Amino acid sequence: ADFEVHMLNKGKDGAHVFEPASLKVAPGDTVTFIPTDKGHNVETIKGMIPDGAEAFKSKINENYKVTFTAPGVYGVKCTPHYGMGMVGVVQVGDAPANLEAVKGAKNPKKAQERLDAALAALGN
Numbered sequence: 001a002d003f004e005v006h007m008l009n010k011g012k013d014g015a016h017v018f019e020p021a022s023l024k025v026a027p028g029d030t031v032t033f034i035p036t037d038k039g040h041n042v043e044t045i046k047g048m049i050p051d052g053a054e055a056f057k058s059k060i061n062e063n064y065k066v067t068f069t070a071p072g073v074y075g076v077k078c079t080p081h082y083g084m085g086m087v088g089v090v091q092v093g094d095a096p097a098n099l100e101a102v103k104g105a106k107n108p109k110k111a112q113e114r115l116d117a118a119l120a121a122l123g124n
């Protein structure tokens, strides 16, 4: 199954957002990060990806389709807007095994707030 995340300068959750900011998928599903507004990208957050996964980083303004295979939670950021909290979580499967490992990852405050909110939205 294929899902979409819009990369936006603003949205319901404020400035510099992924919409949705949380998504539950199954192994092998894809998510396309869409440059609805210019100036964004998507990148894995260090320490917030599960065993079996590989880091990625899209180009600014790239329409970017990612396949998520290994189970667990994946924290993602927009490289330029990470400091302002432009982040999201994609969770592959239920009962993510890496939940405590990713909760320990260091993030600037606005990113941490939104990551914790996304984790809670996903049932964690």
Ligand SMILES: [Cu+2]
Pocket: 016, 039, 040, 041, 078, 079, 080, 081, 086
């Ligand atoms: Cu951005």
